[PDB]
Design an enzyme around this catalytic site. Structure first.
Site, mmCIF file in Angstrom:
data_model
loop_
_atom_site.group_PDB
_atom_site.id
_atom_site.type_symbol
_atom_site.label_atom_id
_atom_site.label_comp_id
_atom_site.label_asym_id
_atom_site.label_seq_id
_atom_site.Cartn_x
_atom_site.Cartn_y
_atom_site.Cartn_z
ATOM 1 C CG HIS A 146 -1.531 1.332 1.705
ATOM 2 N ND1 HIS A 146 -2.978 1.505 1.963
ATOM 3 C CD2 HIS A 146 -0.917 2.231 2.144
ATOM 4 C CE1 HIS A 146 -3.138 2.796 2.309
ATOM 5 N NE2 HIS A 146 -2.186 3.352 2.566
ATOM 6 C CD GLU A 147 1.994 3.436 3.895
ATOM 7 O OE1 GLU A 147 1.722 4.500 3.313
ATOM 8 O OE2 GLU A 147 1.302 3.517 5.128
ATOM 9 C CG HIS A 204 0.524 6.302 -0.274
ATOM 10 N ND1 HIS A 204 -0.523 6.842 -0.613
ATOM 11 C CD2 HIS A 204 0.283 5.766 1.088
ATOM 12 C CE1 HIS A 204 -1.503 6.822 0.016
ATOM 13 N NE2 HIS A 204 -1.157 6.011 1.218
ATOM 14 C CE1 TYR A 262 -0.590 10.503 0.210
ATOM 15 C CE2 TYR A 262 0.545 11.913 -0.973
ATOM 16 C CZ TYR A 262 0.291 10.551 -0.634
ATOM 17 O OH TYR A 262 1.310 9.591 -0.938
ATOM 18 C CD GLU A 298 -3.845 6.869 2.335
ATOM 19 O OE1 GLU A 298 -3.352 7.736 2.769
ATOM 20 O OE2 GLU A 298 -3.643 5.765 2.139
ATOM 21 C CG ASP A 348 -8.633 10.252 7.485
ATOM 22 O OD1 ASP A 348 -7.550 9.840 8.125
ATOM 23 O OD2 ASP A 348 -9.024 9.516 6.624
ATOM 24 C CG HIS A 383 -6.995 6.937 5.969
ATOM 25 N ND1 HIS A 383 -6.006 8.346 6.244
ATOM 26 C CD2 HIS A 383 -5.812 6.085 5.550
ATOM 27 C CE1 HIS A 383 -4.905 8.177 5.949
ATOM 28 N NE2 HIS A 383 -4.638 6.754 5.642
#
Ligand SMILES: [Ca+2]
Ligand SMILES: [Ca+2]
Ligand SMILES: [Ca+2]
Ligand SMILES: [Ca+2]
Ligand SMILES: [Ca+2]
Length: 316
Positions: free
Chosen positions: A142-143, A146, A157, A166, A226, A231
């Site tokens: 996932h990261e 990014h 973002y 995300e 958030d 998210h």
């Protein structure tokens, strides 16, 4: 460090044995010289200054409890590199074999992971809500995804734009988890999440609302927690995906699935071609319509299924 490529062994976060490419120069290093311009893994020694020190080891065996999160960070940056190369014919996140750097033991009790515009970061969690977060391959990929995203579509973002981003990490998160293939599911973070509660997760692609996350546009978060609920509203995009891959009736709209490999294809193309910094949910569909349309012709089952899924998530 300039040195000699070797292969070490160690224990992952779940205590599983796996080999990892190290680098030998006086010490063994967590530096894999076999994938582009290198996968290097760092020790932040519980501080919050990065990257920390290029992890070093005196024997090339990594069976210490402290080494657990490194092992797995190194190992799973690898697999993810492979994923993107092998499946999407792409060389590291920048498409030009950039070094994937990663630091572990970030701060003390850090129940999160991140890509900082330049490297992944993992905390050891607090051993209640999380265990070393790199434990989970979906956490890892996932990261890293990014990064891919911050070199391709550059999806801001915040608000709807952040939520795709995300969502993008959650979709390929699962697509590397399925790549690697060991007990793969459409949940996020089940392997590093709530040790001592079994079968939960951070988010559910199959069923976002399971954990309170939105599964239809109607039901979307309009606030500012958030950062616009990036998210939170990622579930809408996530269920579309889950829907596109797996099929299912959703809010009375039926969806013929088309599999994973076509999932990623349609979504990668779209990321790398049609999505810009400020692409809201309505332009993602447009991206995925046109991506499939290209990769499968304008009347394919593929093109229909993507319309199916977005219609299902309320995205006009
Ligand atoms: Ca050692
Ligand atoms: Ca699992
Ligand atoms: Ca998972
Ligand atoms: Ca759990
Ligand atoms: Ca939440």
């Amino acid at each position: 460090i300039t040195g000699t490529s070797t292969v070490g062994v160690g224990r992952g976060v779940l205590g599983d044995q796996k080999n990892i490419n190290t680098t030998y120069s006086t010490y063994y290093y967590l530096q894999d010289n076999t994938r582009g311009d290198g996968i290097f893994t760092y020790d932040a020694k519980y501080r919050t200054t990065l990257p920390g020190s290029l992890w070093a080891d005196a024997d090339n065996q990594f069976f210490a409890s402290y080494d657990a999160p490194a092992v797995d960070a190194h190992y799973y940056a690898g697999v993810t590199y492979d994923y993107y190369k092998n499946v999407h014919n792409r060389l590291s996140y920048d498409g030009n074999n950039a070094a994937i750097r990663s630091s572990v033991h970030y701060s003390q009790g850090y129940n999160n992971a991140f890509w900082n515009g330049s490297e992944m970061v993992y905390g050891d969690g607090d051993g209640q809500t999380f265990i070393p977060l790199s434990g989970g391959i979906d956490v890892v990929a996932h990261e890293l995804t990014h990064a891919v995203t911050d070199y391709t579509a550059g999806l801001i973002y915040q608000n709807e734009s952040g939520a795709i981003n995300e969502a993008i990490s959650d979709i390929f998160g699962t697509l590397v988890e399925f790549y690697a293939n060991k007990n793969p599911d459409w949940e996020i973070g089940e392997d590093v999440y709530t040790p001592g509660i079994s079968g939960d997760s951070l988010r559910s692609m199959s069923d976002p609302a399971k954990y309170g996350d939105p599964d239809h546009y109607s039901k979307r978060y309009t606030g500012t927690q958030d950062n616009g609920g990036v998210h939170i509203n990622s579930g809408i995009i996530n269920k579309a995906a889950y829907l596109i891959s797996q099929g299912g009736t959703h809010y009375g709209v039926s969806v013929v699935g088309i599999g994973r490999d076509k999932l990623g294809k349609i979504f990668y193309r779209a990321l790398t071609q049609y999505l810009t910094p400020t692409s809201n949910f309505s332009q993602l569909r447009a991206a995925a319509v046109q991506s499939a349309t290209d990769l499968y012709g304008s009347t394919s089952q593929e093109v229909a299924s993507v319309k199916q899924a977005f219609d299902a998530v309320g995205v006009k």
